[model samples]
Target: PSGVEGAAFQSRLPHDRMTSQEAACFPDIISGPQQTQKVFLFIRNRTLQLWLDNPKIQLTFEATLQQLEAPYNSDTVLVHRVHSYLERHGLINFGIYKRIKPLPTKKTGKVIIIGSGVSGLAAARQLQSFGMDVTLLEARDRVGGRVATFRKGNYVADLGAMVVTGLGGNPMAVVSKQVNMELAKIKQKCPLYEANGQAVPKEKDEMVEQEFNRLLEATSYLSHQLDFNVLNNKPVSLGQALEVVIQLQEKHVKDEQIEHWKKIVKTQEELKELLNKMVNLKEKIKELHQQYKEASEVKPPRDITAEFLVKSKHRDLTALCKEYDELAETQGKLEEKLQELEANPPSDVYLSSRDRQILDWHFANLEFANATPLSTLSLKHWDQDDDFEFTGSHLTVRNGYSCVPVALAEGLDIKLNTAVRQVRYTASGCEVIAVNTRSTSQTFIYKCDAVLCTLPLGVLKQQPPAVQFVPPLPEWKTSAVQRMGFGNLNKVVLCFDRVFWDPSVNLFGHVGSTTASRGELFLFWNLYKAPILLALVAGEAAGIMENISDDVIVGRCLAILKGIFGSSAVPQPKETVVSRWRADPWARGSYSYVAAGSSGNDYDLMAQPITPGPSIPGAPQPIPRLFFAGEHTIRNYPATVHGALLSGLREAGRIADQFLGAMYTL
Candidate 1:
């Protein structure tokens, strides 16, 4: 399928020259049996003659060598399987031949980006936009990094990142608009389930939910006290603080009804916070309506505004009146819940058994985002990223998240399947060494002014490393990479012939009995498809699930399904897609988290560029040659697509700043 020239290209002469008659019969020769061998003789003869005819044409070995690499313009994966064979033969055949086989010429760029994910693409885009050259190298055959989409027929599944957690003011918000990619807004309302597929009552389910939220708030308030150990100065874990809050509450307030009713006040406060946001949103709408309402009565500047008013305010009033009507139903539900909570207060300072299960569900859900156990999570600075949170409704891609990458990658020179193995850096610049996966023997090296290391934290932490920084990294960079927790959050996408889960819901919750069981397939997300559900395994379960075979994992998920819905309803999956981020050679784990003893300062340290001083002490230091960018490098924006995006742009601008020395560039 590639330009895979086998032995036919070697030790042979041009047996037959080309003619119009022979060229005409080339297509139909495939109809016969020894036709392949016959055609190969004819074509090989013609091609050999054609090469000899033009000495100045420089029919170079670029195609021959590039063919050895997978996914180059010349090859298919079918060729990929046998590239090992063709590569050996091609190299030798061309080595002996008179016709020139060009060398693997070095490409010198202003910037060489090491990964083709969002960060890599973004860095390249910004640099290339400014007329600077960038060559991006990727280990994988494709781009988009962790944001992958799997499509089969009409079935669409987001195997990696699915949701845009906050759309408004999100960098992805701008990216979506660039491609006219409409995000399907997730329905804000998420309903929960207890055991036996029983829908939890609004009061019972939500009351426990808010009380647990209060418990988390208490942890945040209490975390500062234990942020660092007095003697060792090592940070405490979030798990320790949760125990502190829960046990301390019951130990301090085992009194009477006074303690009981006061617990309800926290829930009341949380409820008001929700209602206040709703009220604020509606207020802006009506306030704008009033501005236009008065403007509608006023005259126009030149021709009198009678025309714009009735058309504008009359319709505006109609919509405003409709808005007033709309607020009632939504507002009533909030107030109704507020009333219900106020009337029947909590009975205990801690919680009941059922309530404790609900609380565990929240902690389990948090693990999906944190991608680690509370015991190993950062106590003080876990959610410190809240300040930079993208504020809006979370939405999934309508087509796929991959589209954005493809769109950005349109004009860039992306070398796929060319996995970088080492970065040889100096005070001046750097040279990156890589091997084409298809051809095992050759090394492809490129030199550049600066190298943007956007490699995932997993690859950085790989023992013996997927990529080695030559001369070794400094202590700070290595320590940051080692300390940051790269945890797994995998999904088992089950495509059923037809499953009996609710048609309307995008989410489903499973409350496991034990605290450890909480991390297992406790969350289920049904994509936009007709009958597919993704059993989201986060925290410890994701790491556990990665070792087992896909068949074994699917069975247990089906067990959970049948446990909730009857056996008849929970049909066997037609096909399943499971993510093993922990097992992937390139991606050692899903994403990064602030580990137990680590802080945001670690993230800051990861971003620090390595500018080596001259090999000779007499010589001066060079400009920063080794740089970092990715979700892990960005302290406030870890574990999200937009963070990865901005980190790239951030590095890009930083590079541009140094090169040109422009205003506000730093």
Candidate 2:
């Protein structure tokens, strides 16, 4: 389940299955200038065609798999349901569509998708484009899962999936272009600050940052040296690896410091000796000066030898007096320095405090990236996917992240407020039992040929299992589901009447005093458009924050901000939004991360398609009945918006390749 080249069907077709043309570049008459519009296009597949229209009058063709499987005149009834749905959505009023149903067709495997998040929408649209019918079901009234957006006047705040990371080779960026959305490149500079509103020293910050970098480098070296993953005997978490590295690095720092302090003492001793030497020299100079003054000022002495001695003594006294003056000035400065050194002696504890805080700050950011603490994170595979990381600047979806999903779902069939409870699947077909969350006591049964379950990893990891299968999942599937990890990284979005912090930079940090407080309100992001700051909390703090009331969280965040910028500059937030992704039943957590016992292989395992029967040579390579797609399913780019979209396109390709050839055949 990995790619969208229409592989299986593309292999079957002799010629190109791709056709694209300009449908329109027209604008709305209501827009007056008629120049501010989008470039519309038509996508013509071998089997089906996509009609791209303007925003106000969008016309689309939707055909279900069941109707196509029916006999000719009587089978035309299948297309009417789509017409009704189109009419229901008010598309019929815009334009009247056609019914070109005459030839007999085969059932090309209908797909019922669960969840209307980014993955579901991508899979739904892509699958439909492949001549396969798709019906996406969403639990929430809105789509995009945790990739939600909140707005207030001019401010558009994304609660989840804030940045579209890695613009290069990212499908999310492609989709954004299709949606005609603006992306703002997140400013790279993030200045650090203390709780007392003071900027951190660049030397200290970079010094510690390099140390942390070496620490990670050392971890990679050690983990490889031991052959931990090859042995399947990983004995360390990221915390343990870091702990050891920090211990070693600390000793090196200590040795350097000891040598530094010894130099300081030696420098003080030299200054004291120099001061004494200056004082003695000055005493000699004074004596010489007194001798010169008395000899030069003697009344009319005319002895040649006496006068020469007096002249020599006078010149020597002048030189000595100049030397004395220099000695006195330098000696006074030396004494001040000696006194200052004596008053403020070097100590290991004094330097380690701020350095440790900076390390703690870096650790907390790692927690934010992984959505968990180092203890639970696998040391061997923490950054296993870094080799495949997409390059380029991270782009923040300025028009809102939710728009990508909304655009993908524009002409697709979506059942909102429908939460799936259980699934019954077999070789013949699958039935999905769901409850309408909006309407109490209402239920639905969606039966289709294949079921693409795009449920989040957190949902699948629920204690009682969020969705039940008639026959439980295989041991391998169950094991994969159990082994993969899911964790939370919540945000407290705050908006003020005016900017309180620095507007020149995009981000600032709050260094935590204690280890436990590291990930609690550590990073604050400025949206660049409004007086908004997104305070991020990951690790244990995020879980604890899930239970805290919004008011309490808001109050705590306000207090933290006030402590950073002072109460005078930091005012109360005009509007506040706190995310409790753990408490969100649909999500259960923010995203997925590999646990200590799990590796990147777990993601691939989760992506493995489910078939009803065991392998049999007679059965056409065990056609997959149930498929999966989500951020957790993608090993390359998990826990990201693009990852979710990519996974969707991947599964659609796999499912479409199996049965997409039933269309466009004479």
Candidate 3:
């Protein structure tokens, strides 16, 4: 009775007030007073058990507990918890984390960079960032080797590398943005004229455009076919391939002309029938005129057969026959030429008057783009680097291209007027011997861990007295340098007090008496609606202009302008500036290009670093002590500012990876 009474009393009282013995005596008891209490107990026990098995778990569990206990506390608990969780999950030591570690505190080493061009400056800046002492040596008194900008009062112009191409992925674009320079698209029209000063007819101009496009397509296709054939051991000359493509084009033209002839024949037949009907009508009119004259006694009407309409129809038929005969003659001539070309390919063949004009323009364009003649340019490799189909208008930096090198050279140790005389490298380090051009007697030696040679290919190819490589460079590299082409491109900038030529015409080319003469002032650029005209001469013409006196070049340009615009309308230039890249010893030529027989592989070979050979037993592991960077070093983008800049960055990255451990990033 007492036990029953106690159980009833406990059940009647509140659960929290019940004694432990009474609660235990009940078969079913309510769990916990609060949900959080039950959850806390479960978590605590599980954490305790985990800590007992693994000591590291205790640290992580404690951090998590601190984060929960002090929700509004400092981030220390949160940071510790995150780090501990990552460490336990094997994420803290992941690949990305290891690679992104802080750069080594110790200095990487010193580096000597020759030529203070964009390439050299890029390498210097990057290596300096990696804690390497970089010494830049430039032969010229100023920086910006080939990227020269000339300023005349309010006018600015680039004497070298005028255009910034491929802006989307071009490194120069990034630099341009960083410098806050504005670029304007070229908005000028190009009109062509004959040497006699006659404007090219619209019809003929259209024909030239069509023929040029056809030639370009044919050449591109043939290049790939020849490459494939060469890979299969079927060697072919550029001349032979060109001949084949020309023959195919000729056949296509012939077929098209045949169709055109059919239309002409049909028109001729229709005209014949019409002429017969008109003759009959003229006879009837003559009879009517006689009858009228006899009946009315009026002045005899003008002879009907000799009427203007009758004579006009007769003239039209004669002209049609003459045109048809001319086409027939042209067809025969084309067939003969095709046969000759197929039978034996020649270095050059006689082109028709029209074809010759088009070819001359083509040659001129090639020279302008490549700074070399088409004959010297590699047919297979000339445009191999033009991978993008750029549709954007060409633009120029308002401040000039030299600003890029100037920006890159800030805070850099660049020695001006210091011409590099020699570069010698060994297993341990490299030495760069240079002399001040103003005082040749004074020379200095720069010793560093690596040497970046950014000298122009033309300068390197020259005999000693320029820059000599100690140990004479490897045969492979020297051969590649020689095989590549470095051609001349000179500019004659003429400024007038007032614009004389058509303001709407931005570019104009005059056909020459001969193909060779066409490239003399081959192109003219009208800059910024100003009275300044830039005359460009390339290849042999450029070299010739470089050798002549500036007065002579100016006189020649004026004469050409006179021919285009009447002598009375054209005025003499108020100021004239000429570029002499070929005459300059430091830069014998303007830029590098693939030669006729050599491919871009030669450029790649030239870019390769020269590793030190075996010497002492315990020499530094084989590393590239002598590095090369320049427009020539970048095979894919040679003769471009971006190419030079990228090559420098590439070499710098290579050095950083080798010396500063693979974890370092530039």
- Predictions in order: lDDT: 0.71, 0.71, 0.68
* TM-score pick, better of 2 and 3: 2
Question: 1-666 in candidate 3: lDDT tens per residue?
Answer: 123232222112222243342233221322445543333333333332233223221235344455343322233433343333223222122111112334457766888889999888887766765567788999998888999988877667788888877454354544654565667666646777777777888877776767766776777777776452252453443334555777876676677656655655665555566556556655655565454445444234756644554455545545555555555575565555545545553323334676567567756777778888766766677776776423346786766777777877887899999988888888777888989899999999999888889999889878654877775788998889788889888888888888888776667876766766657887888765457888888656777776688898899888878888889977878778899898888788899887776788998898888887756876657777888999999877788887888788778767765665542111
- lDDT, candidate 2, 1-666, per-residue tens: 112223212111112321111111112211333221111111111111112122222233433233233232133332443233222222121111232432235435689999989888878766665456789989999888978998878877899988877754455543554566678887888777776667789989898788778788888887888644432355477888888777776677678778767867887777778777877887787787787778777666568877886889878878877787776787678767767766765455523777888888888989998999888888888888786565578877766777777666787899899999998887667899999897858989999988999899889988887799876888998898887779889998898899887777777888888899899888999864777888999878899878778999888788878777778887878888998899899999999888877889989899998888644446654567899999999888898887787788778766865665322111
Model 3, global lDDT: 0.68
- Check candidate 2 and list the clashing pairs: none
| TM-score pick, better of 1 and 3 | 1
TM agreement with the true structure for every prediction: 0.68, 0.70, 0.68
Name the weakest run of 10 consecutive residues (lDDT summed) in model 1: 87-96
| Prediction 3 TM-score vs. true | 0.68
Best-first order by TM-score: 2, 1, 3
Candidate 1 clash total? 1
- List where candidate 2 sits over 4 angstroms from the true fold: 1-107, 228-234, 251-351, 614-622, 661-666
Model 3 alpha-carbon drift over 4 Å, by segment:
1-107, 226-355, 388-391, 617-621, 664-666
lDDT of 1 by residue, 1-666 (tens): 012232222212223333332333333333445634354443343333333333224333444334233223233322222222222222122111233444324432478899898888888876665457789999888898887777887677888888887753465654554575658877656667776667778898878788778888888777665444222565677887788789887776666567656766766666677667667757766777777776656655535466665576667667766765666676677667667867776455467788788788888888998988888888777887886665567887767678777777887899999889999899777899999877857789899888999999999999877788886899978998889999888998888887588767778888877777787888887656457788888767888878889888889888888877877888778878999888887678889998887888899899988987797789976788898999899887888888888788768766865664543111
